[PDB]
Amino acid sequence: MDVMNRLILAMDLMNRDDALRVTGEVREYIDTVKIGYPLVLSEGMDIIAEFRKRFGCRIIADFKVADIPETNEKICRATFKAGADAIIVHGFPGADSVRACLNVAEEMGREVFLLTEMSHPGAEMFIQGAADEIARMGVDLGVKNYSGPSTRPERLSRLREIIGQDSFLISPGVGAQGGDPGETLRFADAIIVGRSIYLADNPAAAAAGIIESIKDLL
Amino acid sequence: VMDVMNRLILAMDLMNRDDALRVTGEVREYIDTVKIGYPLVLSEGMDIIAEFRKRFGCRIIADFKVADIPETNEKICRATFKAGADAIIVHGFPGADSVRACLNVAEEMGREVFLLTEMSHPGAEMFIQGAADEIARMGVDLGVKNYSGPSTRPERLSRLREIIGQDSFLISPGVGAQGGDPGETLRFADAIIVGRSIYLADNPAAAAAGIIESIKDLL
């Protein structure tokens, strides 16, 4: 997956007008948008097609899929029907639940991103202790796309070690949560950035600024 | 705690509005509490909650297995309660801050959180099972009053009931299609969740009535 400027916009605004306006303002800097439940549950799954129509960006559906296999399959089918190119799936619920998503993605020509360790403080309680094993499970299952935490570069580096240089790794927690763009890109292929861009006085300038700070990494 | 008619919650995971409405309407005399998850919501929109309330007047549990960072969890809960859900199901494995974010919105909006502890499917044994007792204890410490645990593992369901105490409300999926027994599950759970055994039946109303007949002495 070739992500422009190694930068994925986390579009978590919850109003269609604002989400479209802000995304349009930064469109010259990105070609990949992560759309999650804040926007989808506020404006409907049709928002995905609207983004494709307006911006011709790739869309990652950040749905943190975390159900039993049968339900996971249904969620993935509905998500890909809406035009998402990829979906983010939790590894913590186990291998059968991940495989269910992999199967639908294969059937529909899409990608699964396996979320190993999360970026927020609560991730330390249960997820962190399982994360290396979740990553190995990904490798065993043939997963090629992963998410790990910008807020813990030593953990992000370990995840990169487990999955190898050929796998694709994206990383949230940059900016608002404390992660550094350049340090994160030592290990991740692409950074996810939400609030530092979409809550900025000038989102275009914010995106341009981040890209300037990593210009040697492009 | 919510008064679930017949101790039976319908997991409405059909993905078409017409079928979902038909089946729910057919079992309405037996069930006043419906769990609506992402299979239906992602297919038909959040307005499906509005339509269920309008048509059936059933309580709605939004089964969204909320599993994000605190800031995103808050947004998800706000959107879900805005649409009219009575309650939302939240994962505990992402930790206490993520759960607290959901509790804070539920408190502000006058709605409820259900904390998902252990899950019912085989994969739950890999990571969730080993964290589940602590997730439940965390819930108790945070003031969580509503929980979900697995019908498919009676020994685990019993332990989770012990941890949360008799006053907490416990619902349990995995009954029927996944192998759990209604009566045995109700030894520990306040209510059972049933999906496919009802909604894939030739006669969903007869399926629901049959389940209820089998647990009549527990009502």
Ligand SMILES: O=c1cc(O)n([C@@H]2O[C@H](COP(=O)(O)O)[C@@H](O)[C@H]2O)c(=O)[nH]1
């Ligand atoms: O570990 C993770 C995984 C995520 O998907 N995310 C998501 O990435 C985005 C981070 O946005 P922000 O840059 O505003 O912190 C949010 O959409 C959040 O749901 C995260 O923050 N941490």
Ligand SMILES: O=c1cc(O)n([C@@H]2O[C@H](COP(=O)(O)O)[C@@H](O)[C@H]2O)c(=O)[nH]1
């Ligand atoms: O541990 C759990 C938690 C759940 O919410 N569920 C949900 O409960 C329902 C089970 O439906 P069924 O009776 O068709 O197996 C599904 O909606 C599933 O997503 C589960 O099966 N196991």
